[PDB]
Structure formats: structure tokens, C-alpha cells
């Protein structure tokens, strides 16, 4: 019995170890622009000052 | 895309368009006749010019390189439309833009001497002033009458030519 309670006790501590060092890697991964910055808006490209704009600019 | 400086000091280079490009006809027209004649040369180049900032615009880099078969289309029906109005209309379009050459180049000043223009491309050369983006329901603003703005000074010699314009019929 005490046995049993303890196989219970030592799988929580190791579903404990692995739930952080999952996190941890959860953290350093790289993170997409839709996460990072606004959501909507997902390019990146800027665009902007459109008044006096000459036809090729985009590359 | 930027103004001059403290002191510029202007340069130029003694040197020819080098190999493969043939000579054009180059716009030898100051601004007056060409702001005079801009919306004729709009109207029978449009597409001309439309393809020209369509082939700058997908080029990219090159730009100015790639699109030299047409600075040297584009320009040359321009020319082609102001030899033709030299030829036809020589009195009332010089006499447009010898009203135009006063009064800052606002087109304001000479609504008087434009409409004996208008009669006179769309007779012979048989070409239109059209203003796009206009929605309809909207008068077009050298076609109204009574404007609000009236100019300083119309030419002396125009508003004869107009006067005559209605004696004669033409208008």
C-alpha cells in the first residue's frame, strides 16, 4: 500500500519535472509575428508615407 | 526628391546616349504649352503613359534601366499631339498659354481664352478634355458658369477672340 502511494507520490513528481522543463522549452522557442506583434496586420512590410510615392518601391 | 543646399554648385557631362539606345525627338516645349495641351496629351496617351508607370513600377531595382523601348514610346506621342495642335490650332492655343504665361501659371486665369480651345482640338485633332475620378452629378469645373473665382485680368486680345467666337458661330 505504502508502496502504491508512493509510485503515485514519485509519477507526480516526475509529471511535475517534465510538465517545467517543457516550459522552459516552451519559452525559448521562437515565436511567430502573429504572437509577437499585432495580430491582424501580419506582414511585417511597412508601407508607409503614401503621398508622394513613385511606382517601384516594393522589391 | 529633395531641395538644393547651402551652396550647390551645378555640373554637367559632355557625353552621348552611349550604344544601343536610338535617338528621340525630346519634348522641346517650355511649361506653358505643355500645361496647355497636358490634358490632350493624357487623353491620346493615356494608356502609353499607364503602361509607362506600370513598367517602372514592376521593375524593381532596374527602374530606370528596363524601360528605355518605352521613355522612348512615351515621349514621342506627346510630340506627335503638339506637332499636330502646332499645326492646327497654332493661333488659340499659343494665344491659351500667352494668357497662361501671366497670373503664376493658375489655371484660374484664363477660362475665357480655354473654351474657344475646347471647340477648336475637338473640331480638327478631334480630342476631349476629360477630368477622371469625377463621380457624375458633378460639373466639371472649366465647364461650369459663373465661377465663384473670377480671374484678375483676362488677355485683351482673347476676350476679342471670343467676342468673335459668338459673332461667328463657332462657340
Known sequence: ?59 | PREAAAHWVPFEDKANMPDNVPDVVEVGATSAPLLSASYFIGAKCKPYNDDFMLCREESQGSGAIDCLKEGRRVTRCAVSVIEDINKSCLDEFRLHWQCLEQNNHQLSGCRKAEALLNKCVFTKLNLEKKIPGLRPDEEPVFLKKDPWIKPAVDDFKSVRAYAEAKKNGTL
Open chain 1, 1 to 59: 500500500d505504502i508502496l502504491n502511494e508512493e509510485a503515485k507520490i514519485v509519477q507526480a513528481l516526475n509529471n511535475q519535472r517534465e510538465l517545467t522543463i517543457k516550459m522552459h522549452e516552451l519559452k525559448r522557442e521562437e515565436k511567430d509575428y502573429a504572437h509577437s506583434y499585432s495580430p491582424l496586420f501580419s506582414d511585417p512590410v511597412p508601407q508607409g508615407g503614401s503621398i508622394g510615392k513613385a511606382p517601384g518601391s516594393s522589391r
